[PDB]
Design a protein around this ligand. Sequence first.
Ligand SMILES: C[C@H]1CCCN(Cc2cc(C(F)(F)F)c3nn(-c4cccc([C@]5(c6nncn6C)C[C@@H](C)C5)c4)c(=O)n3c2)C1
Ligand code: NA
Ligand SMILES: [Zn+2]
Ligand SMILES: [Zn+2]
Length: 384
Amino acid sequence: KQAAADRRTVEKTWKLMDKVVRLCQNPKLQLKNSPPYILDILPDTYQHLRLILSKYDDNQKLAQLSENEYFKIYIDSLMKKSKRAIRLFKEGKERMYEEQSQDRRNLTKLSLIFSHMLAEIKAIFPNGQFQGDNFRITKADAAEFWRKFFGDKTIVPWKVFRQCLHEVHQISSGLEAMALKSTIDLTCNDYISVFEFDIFTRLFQPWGSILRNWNFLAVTHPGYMAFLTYDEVKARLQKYSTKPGSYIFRLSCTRLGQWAIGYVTGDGNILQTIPHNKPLFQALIDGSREGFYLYPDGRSYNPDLTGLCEKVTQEQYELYCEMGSTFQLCKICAENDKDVKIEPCGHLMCTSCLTAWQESDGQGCPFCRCEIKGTEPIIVDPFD
Ligand SMILES: C[C@H]1CCCN(Cc2cc(C(F)(F)F)c3nn(-c4cccc([C@]5(c6nncn6C)C[C@@H](C)C5)c4)c(=O)n3c2)C1
Ligand code: NA
Ligand SMILES: [Zn+2]
Ligand SMILES: [Zn+2]
């Protein structure tokens, strides 16, 4: 239960956001020219929040806004992520100036989250006016699922979303559900908004086989490159500029919900194509037949995608989860955060899973089988 999003609460996010901007303005960091551009995202976020406040310009309008379920979650997540970014500079110290450090990698993860939060607030409050209850989900079969399970809700907890999604498309394991959460929950707030749902269903359409499309195209395909700028797509394909047909497909934080396929032309140039509102697997099948998309990431084997027209190991899901912010999530249930540490081994899980485990098997830790001498409540941060 988050606090009401009153004017005072909104302004606390601006004060925390101005601190993040000040910390990121250190020339040693070189963030002025560093995508997705946190020095442009936080001012844009501030201007959007100001635009919202101007549309709810009276006591009664502000009473409606502070009670808006989506706005309350937005302000609460913005406050939490800004604080996490300040905490990152405080603990990273000199490591914040080394571009390859894990502390700078964590700053890039937060930068992507702020970029996604900005696109989300602009879609849900276009021109500063709430339109979440009138949001258009692009795929009709996806729209029918949202309306069936969540009615006119603009946002739902991940816990509820996953359970309802399982009712239509079965999720086989805790690791798969964790991998899925990092893919849909772009703002890393433990909620799925209708906007995040619309992005995921556009990327992995058609709806009828959405988890098969996601497992194949994002979890196991060697051509998948996650978020990349065009300059990184070029650097990635530059080593293979001597092999026409080499290709990769990436997401763009300035074109949410669409794919960009970068490839080597017959004359050695690197060009890109944005497929239409049609499955990515059909664009890869078409381009393969026509000799444009032959070697994913420059490698000779191009997986047979025709199966998707008419298998994933636990290790693959674990590696997929690296870029995400799911370390705080219980690996067993993939719906509650880790809040208990087993002693002496130190494995972590949620309280419900440990209780369920002690009432079921209980013959040692569920991960290492070592004798459970004790338990200890803990708080886990996604960057641990
Ligand atoms: C715009 C440029 C800026 C400079 C840096 N480069 C390279 C870069 C760097 C990072 C990092 F770690 F440093 F922050 C990174 N994190 N990240 C990512 C984060 C959360 C989830 C995801 C998904 C995913 N893709 N594979 C696994 N999963 C969980 C794709 C989603 C639908 C789910 C990805 C991603 O794409 N990153 C790409 C990008
Ligand atoms: Na979210
Ligand atoms: Zn659990
Ligand atoms: Zn253990």
